[PDB]
Paper text:
To understand if oncogenic mutations at G12, G13, and Q61 positions in [name] have any effect on [name]-RBDCRD interaction interfaces, and to identify any druggable pockets at the [name]-RBDCRD interface, we attempted to crystallize and solve the structures of G12C/D/V, G13D, and Q61L/R mutants of [name] in complex with [name](RBDCRD). We were able to obtain well-diffracting crystals of [name], G13D, and Q61R mutants of [name] complexed with [name](RBDCRD) and solved their structures in the resolution range between 2.11–2.87 Å. Since the mutant structures belong to the same crystal form as the WT [name]-RBDCRD structure obtained in crystal form II, we used this structure to examine any structural changes in [name] and at [name]-RBDCRD interfaces. Structural superposition of WT [name]-RBDCRD with all three mutant structures shows similar interaction interfaces, suggesting that the two [name]-binding domains of [name] bind to oncogenic [name] mutants similarly to WT [name]. A closer examination of the switch regions of [name] shows minor conformational changes in the structures of oncogenic mutants complexed with RBDCRD when compared with WT [name]-RBDCRD structure. The presence of a larger side chain at G12, G13, or Q61 position results in local rearrangement of side chains of some of the neighboring residues present in the switch regions without perturbing interactions at [name]-RBDCRD interfaces. In the [name] [name]-RBDCRD structure, [name] residue Y32 adopts a different rotameric conformation to accommodate the side chain of Val at position 12. The side chain of R61 in the [name] Q61R-RBDCRD structure points towards the [name]-[name] interface and occupies an empty space surrounded by [name] residues Y64, P34, and I36, therefore not impacting the [name]-[name] interface. These results suggest that [name] does not differentiate between WT and oncogenic mutants of active [name].
The interaction of membrane-bound active [name] with [name] is the first step in the activation of this pathway. Active [name] recruits [name] to the membrane where [name] dimerizes and becomes active. The N-terminal CR1 region contains the [name]-binding domain ([name]) and the cysteine-rich domain ([name]), the CR2 region contains a 14-3-3 recognition site, whereas the C-terminal CR3 region includes the kinase domain and a second binding site for 14-3-3 proteins. Here, we present crystal structures of wild-type and oncogenic mutants of [name] in complex with the [name] and [name] of [name].
Author numbering:
A (entry chain A): 1 to 168
B (entry chain B): 55 to 188
The structure:
């Protein structure tokens, strides 16, 4: 079985833990608890091929500006997640984009830009901004939401699909 | 610096901060349930990088602050009926129903150990641990 090292990066309170927990145990955690370093492994079937996902939930806090460079190396795919309720995370995506591509030495790094918290009425970032930013990096864009589970599959599914498209 | 890294079963790991007075069971109960791991079927060990033995078993309700800096490891108890799934392609000739969404299942996947049949787009809703009492 093929394993895929996945790393979820983003700002604080963006929704990295709520997305992975909904992907792992089909549940939604409402009360917020910050991530320091959480590793998850689960078998997911991607296009008729059962593969294992080694998801790494990272800390959006800037207090770990050293361990971030380590796990960004051994990772194969990356989830650049931002909350549409916070416009600072949308521009912070460039910082996570450049810091990963720096420890990768390749403009063609398997990533997908996903937009979380689409169920909230306090939308600040629209689809036109994220669709063009996705065209700026050459990566797909998936609008998600951890509660209603809108496209939580298609976020991780398309990330593994790019890793497969990147390999062969 | 006020945290403890714990290696979880099935080659997983977590890092939790210690609100002092909490036990090892209080600090790790959340990280085990979200991974489909039952705390009653687990033991917490202190990794011994020394000679003759790689870890020593610890009580679940011991103070977590008494182990700050060390590296702990949670492992399944001996011979617990928990394993990993073994998925395979399966075409259901007779009409069958998915175990997740309870809809018509035509071309899906089933586990050869517990029999979990499901749509492909529901494979993420199957429990992460395989219960085997056969
Ligand atoms: N309405 C709504 N709330 C969400 C959604 N996703 C997460 N939240 C909520 O917003 C917060 C997100 O928390 P969390 O997922 O831990 O974000 P994080 O990115 O993991 N935080 P951190 O990086 O510090 O560890 C929590 O309050 C969570 O319940 C979503 O799709 N919709
Ligand atoms: Cl990992
Ligand atoms: Cl382990
Ligand atoms: Mg988190
Ligand atoms: Zn099974
Ligand atoms: Zn189904």
């Amino acid at each position: 079985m093929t394993e895929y090292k996945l790393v979820v990066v983003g700002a604080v309170g963006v929704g990295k833990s709520a997305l992975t927990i909904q992907l792992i145990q089909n549940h939604f955690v409402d009360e917020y608890d910050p991530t320091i370093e959480d590793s998850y492994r689960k078998q997911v079937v991607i296009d008729g091929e059962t593969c294992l996902l080694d998801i790494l939930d990272t800390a959006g806090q800037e207090e770990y500006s050293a361990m971030r460079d380590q796990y960004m190396r051994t990772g194969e795919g990356f989830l650049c997640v931002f909350a549409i309720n916070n416009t600072k995370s949308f521009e912070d995506i460039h910082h996570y984009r450049e810091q990963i591509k720096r420890v990768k030495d390749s403009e063609d790094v398997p990533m997908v830009l996903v937009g979380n918290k689409s169920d909230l009425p306090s939308r600040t970032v629209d689809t036109k901004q994220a669709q063009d930013l996705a065209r700026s990096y050459g990566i797909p864009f998936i609008e998600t939401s951890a509660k209603t589970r809108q496209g939580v599959d298609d976020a991780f599914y398309t990330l593994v699909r790019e890793i497969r498209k990147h390999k062969e | 610096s006020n945290t403890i890294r714990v290696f979880l079963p099935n080659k997983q790991r977590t890092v939790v901060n210690v609100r002092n007075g909490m036990s090892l069971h209080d600090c790790l109960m959340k990280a085990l349930k979200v991974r489909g791991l039952q705390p009653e079927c687990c033991a917490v060990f202190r990794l011994l990088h020394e000679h003759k033995g790689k870890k020593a078993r610890l009580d679940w309700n011991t103070d977590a602050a008494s182990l700050i800096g060390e590296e702990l490891q949670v492992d399944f108890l001996d011979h617990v009926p928990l394993t990993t799934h073994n998925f395979a392609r399966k075409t259901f000739l007779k009409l069958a129903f998915c175990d997740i969404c309870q809809k018509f299942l035509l071309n899906g996947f089933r586990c050869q150990t517990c029999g979990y049949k499901f749509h492909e787009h529901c494979s993420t809703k199957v429990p992460t641990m395989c219960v085997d009492w056969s």
